[PDB]
């Protein structure tokens, strides 16, 4: 079942690898080499998660917990019941995410548009890899990764935050929180402006870009334009992701003491009387 304007876009070509061996659709979904890899990795990960849940002794969605090994195992492999299943699932998840990104690249190439969406997804993939790969590698044990549980991956966050006394005093955490809040505000304003322009009171004509420009110049004295707002939003989201990754990666391997004490450089400058 296609949309009324979809058929002319369903042409062949634009594949990074595979040619016409996997060039077809299954319902709405597009299949390729990376679609096959994604399906394999995702199915294996899900079935392994449910096998671990069965061996744990509970099928409750709130209570399933698959945890990394102990710190004594180091960077080596652990028994599959004592945390090796977590490593296998991590490998599968990394493969699935990379395959998803490359499938998006192939779809972009076929449609003849830009490659901004895979580039944006790469930042989230980078943040996840920093959480599960880079920081445990620098700290020296695979046991520093978070567990795969709906409610058990928040206890890890709490304990990791309280390991430095007051995590709100981390400057990179401040930057990331500010970026998050600014992104949410900008999205709300953009959606509201577009909807108000396209939906006037009953019996009134629709509006245009000039009306929106006037509104925001009357409101706050400046207008960014219909093209600059999208750039601003994309940059804000990417900056939020990048600074979240930086904040998590500087906490363990670079700083060791409490975060409030880091401000002693400001509190003890020679310029003060």
């Amino acid at each position: 079942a296609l949309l009324s304007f979809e058929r002319k876009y369903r042409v062949r070509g634009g594949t990074l690898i595979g040619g016409d061996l996997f060039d077809f659709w299954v319902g709405p979904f597009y299949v390729g080499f990376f679609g096959v890899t994604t399906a394999f990795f995702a199915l294996l990960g899900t079935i392994l998660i449910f096998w671990g849940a069965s061996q744990q002794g509970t099928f409750n969605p709130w209570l399933i917990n698959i945890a990394p090994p102990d710190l004594s195992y180091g960077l080596g492999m652990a028994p599959l019941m004592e945390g090796g299943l977590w490593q296998i699932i991590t490998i599968c998840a990394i493969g699935a995410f990379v395959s998803w990104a490359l499938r998006e690249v192939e779809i972009c190439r076929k449609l003849g548009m830009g490659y901004h969406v895979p580039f944006a997804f790469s930042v989230a993939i980078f943040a996840y890899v920093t959480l599960v790969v880079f920081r445990p590698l620098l700290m020296g044990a695979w046991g520093h990764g978070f567990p795969y549980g709906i409610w058990s991956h928040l206890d890890w966050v709490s304990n990791t935050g309280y390991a430095y006394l007051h995590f709100h005093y981390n400057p990179a955490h401040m930057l990331a929180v500010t970026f998050f809040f600014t992104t949410t505000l900008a999205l709300a304003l953009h959606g509201a402006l577009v909807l108000s322009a396209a939906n006037p009171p009953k019996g009134e004509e629709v509006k245009g870009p000039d009306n929106e420009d006037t509104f925001f110049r009357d409101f706050i004295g400046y207008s960014i334009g219909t093209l600059g707002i999208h750039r601003v939003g994309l940059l804000l989201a990417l900056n939020a992701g990048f600074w979240s990754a930086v904040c998590i990666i500087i906490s363990g391997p670079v700083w060791t003491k409490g975060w409030p004490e880091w401000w002693n450089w400001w509190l003890e400058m020679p310029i003060w009387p």
Partner: protein, 255 residues
């Protein structure tokens, strides 16, 4: 505080009420987004047997400016193309299509265009929105490199002509198009290039999407002082189709 029954208290009641509201909101949001492209069709152009679990929404009316009438959605597809040069590569559904003639000249694939209205887009005053820079009073270059007078290099290293003018957006003070004057060897007349597909350097302007031989078949504008939505679509998509159809190596797997 007390409980109504068992462990049920005010928080649980609020949670369940939010569950119901969220379900209704999801229904409304999904139904609101089905005003274009429905009902679904199969690969032979007929209506499919399956239409999904969400029924079609009700009608809404838009009152357009400048006396252009009204638009009611959902409705019939007025942007539908009539005769497409495409061929099925299979007897069932789910397989690609094969171009019959020249995909860049036939407007199929990444070179496809939509049948928009054959009238220019207007600003608040009722004037055409995009105007050449030689007819806009009080406009001038304030930053960057001026591309006027520079040669244009194609995707294969061929110089086809010089940049002679720019078409600007007066309402938003933004450049939209770059006009090109072709050498007699590479064609005749003038052609437009959208600003998003060019790279201005200090001594040249490069267009990597298409080659030198593809410049004579760019769609031309009917009027020298304005451009319509249909023409912009055909010009802009012709330029996009070259990222795949300008060479055989761009279509085959990269490996």
């Amino acid at each position: 505080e007390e409980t109504f029954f068992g462990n049920f208290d005010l928080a649980s009641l609020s949670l369940w009420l939010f569950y119901g509201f969220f379900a209704l909101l999801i229904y409304y949001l999904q139904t609101e987004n089905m005003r274009e492209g429905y009902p679904l069709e199969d690969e032979d152009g007929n209506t499919a047997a399956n239409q999904g679990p969400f029924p079609l929404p009700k009608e809404k009316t838009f009152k357009l400016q400048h006396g252009r009438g009204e638009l009611t959605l959902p409705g019939e597809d007025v942007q539908r193309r009539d005769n497409l040069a495409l061929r099925k590569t299979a007897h069932g559904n789910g397989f690609p299509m094969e171009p019959t003639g020249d995909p860049m000249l036939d407007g199929v694939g990444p070179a496809s265009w939509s049948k928009r209205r054959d009238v220019p887009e207007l600003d608040a005053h009722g004037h055409p929105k995009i105007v050449p820079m030689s007819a806009a009073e009080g406009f001038g270059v304030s930053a960057g490199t001026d591309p006027r007078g520079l040669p244009v290099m194609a995707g294969d290293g061929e110089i086809v002509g010089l940049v002679s003018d720019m078409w600007i957006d007066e309402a938003e003070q933004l450049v939209r198009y770059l006009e090109l004057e072709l050498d007699p060897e590479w064609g005749d007349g003038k052609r437009l290039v959208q600003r998003q597909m060019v790279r201005i350097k200090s001594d040249r302007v490069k267009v990597r999407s298409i080659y030198g031989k593809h410049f004579k078949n760019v769609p031309k504008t009917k009027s020298p002082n304005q451009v319509t939505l249909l023409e912009e679509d055909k010009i802009m998509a012709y330029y996009a189709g070259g990222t795949l159809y300008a060479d055989e190596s761009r279509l085959e797997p990269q490996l």
